[PDB]
């Protein structure tokens, strides 16, 4: 970080209604789906498995199993398409990136709560 | 990969135009009498 301009010209795009969470926690994102003309709200329940970036480029990933197939989403932390986020479970991991959950399946991919 | 014709004394002496050494800095000393290199350790230590 050389000068304090990049963080000064993007200080009006950051959010302040976001809760604190760490990789391994179960979240419930409320994405704002926009179809033909009607605006609905789709809920996506999963477990954070990544958290990189810094400032207005921060991003997070949530993994979940739909109908036997694993799905992964990734939206910018400060995105206006996210109604609100709410932590519902606090997991206990030993790393920062859980990439070993992509091969696990069944009761082997179970995370213990603190 | 082998010379087609032998080189003459003219062409050989023309290629050795930039092949030479250059005079160094040689900074004068304030109290020693002898000379020394610039930014060096001696009685002058440059000037």
């Amino acid at each position: 970080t050389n000068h304090k301009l990049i963080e000064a010209v993007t200080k009006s795009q950051l959010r302040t209604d976001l809760p604190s969470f760490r990789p391994g926690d179960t979240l419930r994102v409320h994405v704002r789906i926009i179809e033909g003309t009607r605006e609905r709200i789709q809920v996506f329940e999963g477990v954070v498995i990544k958290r990189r970036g810094g400032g207005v480029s921060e991003t997070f990933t949530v993994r979940k199993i739909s109908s036997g197939v694993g799905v992964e989403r990734t939206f910018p932390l400060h995105t206006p398409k996210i109604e609100k986020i709410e932590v519902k479970r606090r997991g206990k991991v030993r790393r920062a990136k859980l990439y070993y959950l992509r091969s696990l399946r069944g009761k082997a991919a179970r995370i213990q709560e603190i | 990969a082998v010379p087609k014709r032998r080189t003459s004394k003219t062409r050989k002496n023309k290629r050795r135009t930039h092949f030479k050494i250059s005079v160094p800095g040689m900074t004068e000393c304030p109290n020693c009498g002898e000379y020394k290199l610039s930014h060096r350790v001696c009685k002058n230590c440059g000037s």
């Binding site: 990049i6 926009i34 398409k81 | -």
Partner: protein
């Protein structure tokens, strides 16, 4: 019309309308002052010289391009301004809406204006024929001795020589590139910065010129 000189800071992202991500490039441009006004009855073409960065004034023993006097000083003394670091010319703007000593601000541009950025490239030094030009390599196995090297450079007996521009290895980098049809996301007057949608050529802390796209 509407010309200005700025410095490339870095690259960030800004969310626009309908939550759409937009990658932008922060360009700082301040202390822009006209230095001269070329006419057609004294030079044969209308243009205006503009400065950019400032520097220290009068100095004696100074073996560095940062602070001294004489030549540059005098030319900068003609108008009411201090010595400039960079100087350029613009023959696309009107020479009747400016005055020797005016302060070119960043309020001339408005969000939604198409502009053309111009600047030198980074530089990779001596590069090969597989990097400089998009060429393919030979088999990596099957008893092959041809990898990242060029192929033939000519024919045979007929025209026994190499035509100009055979695309061979050499230094590739420092080149003047000009991206066209860009966009001004938002302009800030507090920090005097401009947000261009996309990426301009050149490295960090580099000189870049902005001009209103002709097309």
């Amino acid at each position: 019309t509407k010309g200005i000189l700025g410095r490339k800071i870095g690259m960030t992202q800004v969310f626009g309308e309908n939550g759409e991500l937009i990658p932008v490039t922060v360009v700082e441009a301040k202390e822009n002052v006209v230095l001269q006004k070329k006419t057609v009855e004294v030079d044969g073409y209308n243009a205006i010289q503009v400065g950019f960065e400032d520097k220290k004034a009068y100095k004696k023993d100074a073996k560095s391009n940062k602070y001294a006097n004489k030549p540059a000083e005098g030319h900068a003394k003609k108008a009411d301004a201090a010595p400039k670091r960079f100087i350029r010319e613009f023959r696309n703007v009107d020479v009747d809406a400016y005055e020797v000593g005016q302060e070119v601000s960043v309020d001339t541009f408005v969000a939604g204006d198409v502009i053309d950025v111009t600047g030198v490239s980074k530089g990779k030094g001596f590069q090969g024929a597989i990097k400089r030009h998009g060429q393919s390599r030979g088999p990596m196995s099957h008893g092959s001795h041809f990898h990242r090297a060029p192929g033939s450079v000519g024919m045979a007996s007929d025209a026994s020589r190499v035509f100009k521009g055979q695309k061979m290895p050499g230094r590739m980098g420092g080149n003047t590139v000009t991206v066209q049809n860009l966009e001004v996301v938002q302009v800030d007057t507090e920090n005097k910065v401009i947000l261009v949608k996309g990426n301009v050529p050149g490295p960090k802390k580099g000189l870049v010129e902005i001009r209103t796209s002709i097309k």
